[PDB]
Each structure stands twice: as structure tokens, then as C-alpha cells.
């Protein structure tokens, strides 16, 4: 067992790739674009191209963070939910996924139901808060 770099475990199965989540997660907002950049210096050809990159790097981070918040998974690397798996998105068993598939292959397999799955997860977290207000 050895530590990997960024995306170094893209070709390994899920069972082995899931042990390197913090390698990819640690690089989502931080980069060299936020340096001091060594005729308005912020209107030059590459003054604008740098500014757009800074805003793009922030939207990409917040796009994923928006979903984590709605599902109640803020501040977690691996978050468990209360949504049962539906055997129409995929009916593969344990070994056929975590020992035979890569994260790229799988995410392409359920790519038709990612939008549906996202909506269900948000709706589930909403019920937990509803069921808690009228329980305490």
C-alpha cells in the first residue's frame, strides 16, 4: 500500500480507490491562480484570463458544496443516507461493483439516474427535519 497523487487511483477498482478520497478532495479550490500575478495590469490579456479562472474555481467548489448541504452531508468525506437503493438504477451485487468496476465506469452506468437520485436525496433530508420538528 502506497499513497497516490491527484487522480492516481482512477484506474483502480472502487474498493481500492475509495481509500484515496482526500487526495482529490484536498484540491478543489486551492491553486496557483490565487497568486499575486508578479496599461492596467488587471485589464491585460492575461489579467482577464486569470480573473475568470478565479471565479470558475469558486463556482466549481460551491457547485458540489450546494448538494452536500441539501443532503445533510456537510463536513463529511463519506456520508451515509437513509434512501434505500432502487434496483432499477443498477442491480449489481457487492463484488460486481467494489471489486470489478472503476468509479468512471460506474458513474457512466447510473448516469441516467443521477438527476433522479439527487432529487430523492434532497427530499429525504427534508423529511428528517420535518419529522424532527414535530417530534421534539
Amino acid at each position, epitope marked *: 500500500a502506497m499513497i497516490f497523487g491527484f487522480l492516481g487511483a482512477a484506474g483502480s477498482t472502487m*474498493g481500492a480507490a475509495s481509500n484515496t478520497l482526500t487526495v482529490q478532495a484536498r484540491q478543489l479550490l486551492s491553486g496557483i491562480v490565487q497568486q499575486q500575478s508578479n496599461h492596467l495590469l488587471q485589464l491585460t490579456v492575461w489579467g482577464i484570463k486569470q480573473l475568470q479562472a478565479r471565479v470558475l474555481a469558486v463556482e466549481r467548489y460551491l457547485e458540489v458544496q450546494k448538494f452536500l448541504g441539501l443532503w445533510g452531508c456537510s463536513g463529511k468525506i463519506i456520508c451515509c443516507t437513509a434512501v434505500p437503493w432502487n434496483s432499477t438504477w443498477s442491480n449489481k*451485487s457487492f463484488e460486481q461493483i467494489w*471489486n470489478n468496476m472503476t468509479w468512471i465506469e460506474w458513474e457512466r452506468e447510473i448516469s441516467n439516474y443521477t438527476s433522479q437520485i439527487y432529487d430523492i436525496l434532497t427530499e429525504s433530508q427534508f423529511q428528517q427535519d420535518i419529522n424532527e420538528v414535530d417530534l421534539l
Partner: antibody
Amino acid sequence: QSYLVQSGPEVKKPGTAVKVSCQASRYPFTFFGISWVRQAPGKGPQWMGWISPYNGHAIYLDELKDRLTLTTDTDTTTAYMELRNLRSADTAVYFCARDHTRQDSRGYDFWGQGTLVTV
Amino acid sequence: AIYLTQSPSSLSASVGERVTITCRASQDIGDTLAWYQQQPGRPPFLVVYRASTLNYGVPSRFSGGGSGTRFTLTISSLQPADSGTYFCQQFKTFPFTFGPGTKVEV
């Protein structure tokens, strides 16, 4: 996809050395491990060794520990097996079996037609 | 070095009965067991793996179960294609030993 084909039968005199090659094609060779079993005539299969075509790591059986060695070739995607000091009881059909999955297979997906060797 | 012992040697059978094949173990094996169907002149074909799961293309009438040391292979509606012998293999110890094998008479 994927299919394992072995060589033809061999009639080797006792005491000689026999090499049998199992050629794998039409699938990623390095992803799945390869196992060898021998079905003694009128008997059940026996497990001999397991070879990883990715890093070459091999596993052998004690009785065959000092007699059997497994080697794998990547560029032409072929698996080789050599056995030396052929006792008279080594006559059996030899199979090459692909692992079920890429990790902790617990099963064999595809086999070869077999190579019956007489000694 | 776990030895697999399975009985009975032979099963007198015809169409439509509950034929059961039992594979015992000499040590704790767990759910790591597989069943192979061998037809004459053909290499063994995997039918059940993990002692519960069914391989691709096998009819649903097949089934397996048990854990620890005792395992079974039951065919509810035996049909004229389930001929040949069967083997059980263990997949946790340094050698992956097979079983003596049982033949079904049809």
C-alpha cells in the same frame, strides 16, 4: 469478450520438461489473474497455482513448489506453464482459468479447452 | 491446507425432484465457496459463487446456501440438461482446493 486457448496435446517421455502456453485475447490481459488446474483422468480438478499478469506475483502448491514455475508474457498476452521432472502420475488434462473479477475473484470465469499430456 | 469433503458420491435422479449436493469443510471457510458444473468433454462451468450468488446465464432453479462448514446445492426442477458431475471449491486458504465430486444419474 475474452477467450483462453491452449496448445495441442503432448506425449513427453518421463523425466523430460513440458511447457504449455495459454493464450489470452480480446480482453484486458493484465486486469484479471490466471489460475492453472489439472484434471487427472477419471478424477476431479486439482489446483496448482495462481499467477498475476499485472505484477507477476505467483502462488504455488507445496508439492509443486520446487518443480513448477509460472511465467507471464505481456506484449503478446500469453500465459506459460513449465513442469520439470515429470513423474508417471502427472498425466492429466491441464486447464488455464481466468479470475472472476479484478480483486478477490472467488470463482473462475473462462477456461481453456485443455491439454492432455501423457507421461 | 483445508480439505473439502462432499457427499453423496452419486444421486439417482429423474425429472422434477429436489436433488441436494452437500459439501463439507475441514475448517471454517465462510461464504467463500463456488460450485462448478462439468459436462463430458467440456471444462468445468461455474454456476454458483459466494455460496449464494448465481453465475450469468444459469437457470434460476439452481440455489445454494449455508456458511461456516456446511453448504448445499439444490435444484428444484431437475431437467435433462443438469447432467455431469459437480465440484465445490474453497477460496480463502493459500491453496484453493476442490472437492472429490458427485455425479447425477439421469
